[PDB]
Amino acid sequence: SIDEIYKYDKKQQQEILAAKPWTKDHHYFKYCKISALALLKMVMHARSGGNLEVMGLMLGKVDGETMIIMDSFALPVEGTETRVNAQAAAYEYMAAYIENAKQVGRLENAIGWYHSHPGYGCWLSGIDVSTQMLNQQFQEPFVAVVIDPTRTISAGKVNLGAFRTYPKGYKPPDEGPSEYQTIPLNKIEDFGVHCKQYYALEVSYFKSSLDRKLLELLWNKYWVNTLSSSSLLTNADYTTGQVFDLSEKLEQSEAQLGRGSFMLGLETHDRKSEDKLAKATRDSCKTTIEAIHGLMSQVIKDKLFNQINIS
Amino acid sequence: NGFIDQIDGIVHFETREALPTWDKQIQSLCFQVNNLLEKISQTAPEWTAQAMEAQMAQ
Amino acid sequence: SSNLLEQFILLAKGTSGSALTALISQVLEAPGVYVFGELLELANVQELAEGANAAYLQLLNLFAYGTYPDYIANKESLPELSTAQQNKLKHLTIVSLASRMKCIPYSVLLKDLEMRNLRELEDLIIEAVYTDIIQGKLDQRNQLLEVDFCIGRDIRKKDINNIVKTLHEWCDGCEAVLLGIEQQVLRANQYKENHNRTQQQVEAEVTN
Amino acid sequence: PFIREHIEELLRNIRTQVLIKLIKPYTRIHIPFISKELNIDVADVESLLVQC
């Protein structure tokens, strides 16, 4: 209801999972309620991976034709497109959460899995639509939510949207893009075909959750690990390895300025990848900002403890 | 760990030095404050709330 | 230990005379007692003199203010020790040089403790690590010893001023660094606001 | 004569595996030290160290 969906109700989850209304019509889910506290945990886990793809797991309940996204945690799996069937790593976390919830009188189970698709916008490719169909028949219900961390920086728009892939025997023959975003000139042909496999849902927001309340009691004793900075020695191989890739980009810029993408008859459309000098500038600054970021964590340590001395 | 020197016949043992020892002393120093904070609040819980209000008053 | 320190201070204040002389040798022989400040300032040990009673008073002063070379110079005037009292004196010699200097070279401990190698010299130091007595690290490149945690010998009645002086620079020192970090955030945020305004007003006048 | 032409390469590959398991602990190892453990003359040690 209105005031019952804001809290955890045991009678609401006992009249839905026992009857399973999703087995009659696959288009039962219309809206999706994502907690405001869990949204910050999904945009922070995908931002730490950078250009890579990561996956996680969401927990919550149901209340009719609207899903509830309560708590959510990260997963050590390297996304879903790289590693086929990424739900095998979450079996150890689910076996320890359901057993600890049935003893206290709680029927909260799995609600969906979230990932990240940086680069080609927030959509479902041909790999995510195949693995989701095999998980909805065993661990129901599920929902795929895509978060773009590298798109809310330049454009400034918080990309968020939940989708659900239709199973075999219910896909529409013709359906336009429900949630259309930006796609680079490379995989735009697959957007007009794979859009009929899933559909967008009107996302909502509410305040509840429970995971955002026990992290303060842990910080009272785990604060000695949060100060473990010094990023200059952690990913030292990634900083030096990025300079090798910069030399290959700088060599391509020399041939771009020599030949020139402005010829007679057909200009500004000669070379494949134009503006090589402008793109190589951001790549050179990436190795500089990441190098001075690790030093700032060391200078700040030599100004608070090393400047004390002794009499 | 360690290496063996065949010139003078003196075997040395590795006990960590240089940069890896700098982060170990910082984590060990901050760990002593965490254990000391649990002892102050256990022996005298009234002094923990009084010391926190002194920073907000200044 | 910590529970044994409250039992030796109660038996010395209840009896005196010949019973106090026998209690001094039982404290130094029994392990766990690493403090001798609360027993030296008492008036029970000060009344022991004239004969063998005066030797126990001088031995208690060497275990708190003296070192290892200070005992071998007058071993004939002081009573002998055993396999446990001699090893306890070497633990107090390491914490004695740490109160004056931060780092102690290996050549200093090799002469005071009279050794020949480094492992045998550090053998008496690692025994105090598991008992929460001496905690620190060993340096091999500089051949020094950085003592971090150690016993305070007595009740610290003279070097207690360095405790408040070190904590005052840690609390007041954080205010000077906080003013620089907060000023850097305002300077970095103001540069982004001025750059966003100067990049949008210069591009809108190109069409006009 | 078929296996005789390859009997020399098989003997040289064994000396390379033993030199790896002995050069890790010893930092500055002596040249005649590896010749005494392998029970070989010093004539082929100088030629094998260059190829290794």
For chain B, say whether D27 makes contact (Cβ under 8 Å): yes
The total number of residues shown for chain A amounts to 311
- The three-class DSSP label of residue C187 is helix
Read off the tokens for A128: 């995510």
Measure CB to CB from residue C173 to each of A300, A308, A310 and give the nearest one.
A308
Q: Please list, residue by residue across A24-54, b when 16 or more beta carbons sit within 10 angstroms of its beta carbon and e when fewer do.
A: eebeebeebbbbebbbebbbebbbeeeeebb
Please report, for residues A289, C185, C187, C194, C198, the alpha-carbon distance to residue C190 in angstroms, rounded to integers and kept in the order given: 19, 8, 5, 6, 12
For residue A90, with 0-12 CB atoms within 10 Å meaning exposed, 13-18 middle and 19 or more buried, which class applies?
buried
Read off the tokens for C131: 């008992």
For chain B, say whether C102 makes contact (Cβ under 8 Å): no
The total number of residues shown for chain D amounts to 52
- Taking the CA of residue A23 as centre, how many other CA atoms within 13 Å lie in the half-sphere pointing to its CB? 8
Residue from C147, C149, C142, C85 nearest C122 by CA: C147
Point out which residues pair with C105 in neighbouring strands.
C144
Read off the tokens for A19: 């009857």
Strands A56-60 and A72-74: antiparallel
Q: E strand or H helix at A298, and its extent? A: helix A276-299
Amino acid symbol at B53: E
For chain D, say whether B42 makes contact (Cβ under 8 Å): no
Best of C164, C169, C178, C181 to disrupt the A interface by mutation (most A CBs within 10 Å)? C169
Alpha-carbon distance of D41 to D36, in angstroms, equals 8
Alpha-carbon distance of A259 to A267, in angstroms, equals 12
Read off the tokens for A223: 């604060």
Amino acid symbol at C67: T
Q: E strand or H helix at B39, and its extent? A: helix B20-43
| CB of C141 closer than 8 Å to CB of C106 | no
Flag if A311 and C162 touch (Cβ within 8 Å): yes
Cβ–Cβ contacts within 10 Å for residue C156, how many? 14
Residue from A79, A80, A58 nearest A69 by CA: A58
A237 known member of a binding site: no
| CB of B36 closer than 8 Å to CB of A223 | no
- The three-class DSSP label of residue A249 is helix
Structure method: cryo-EM
Alpha-carbon distance of A53 to A82, in angstroms, equals 8
For chain A, say whether B18 makes contact (Cβ under 8 Å): no
Instruction: Quote the DSSP letter at residue D26.
Output: B
Q: Distance from CA of residue A164 to its chain's centroid?
A: 16
Flag if A310 and C173 touch (Cβ within 8 Å): no
| CB of A149 closer than 8 Å to CB of A46 | yes
Amino acid symbol at A280: A
In three state form, how does the secondary structure of C107-132 look? HHHHHHCCCCCHHHHHHHHHCCCCCC
For residue C160, with 0-12 CB atoms within 10 Å meaning exposed, 13-18 middle and 19 or more buried, which class applies?
exposed
Distance from the C173 Cα atom to the nearest Cα atom in chain A, whole angstroms: 7
User: Which distant-in-sequence residues (6+ apart) come within 8 Å of C44 by Cβ?
Assistant: C12, C13, C16, C20
Residue written as tokens 């010139």?
Answer: B7
Alpha-carbon distance of C170 to C165, in angstroms, equals 9
- The three-class DSSP label of residue B47 is helix
| CB of A144 closer than 8 Å to CB of A114 | yes
Report the residue of chain C nearest A303, measured CA to CA. C177
Residue from C82, C30, C26, C95 nearest C56 by CA: C26
Distance from the A75 Cα atom to the nearest Cα atom in chain C, whole angstroms: 33
For residue A141, say if its preceding peptide bond is cis, omega within 30 degrees of 0.
yes
Read off the tokens for A26: 């696959």
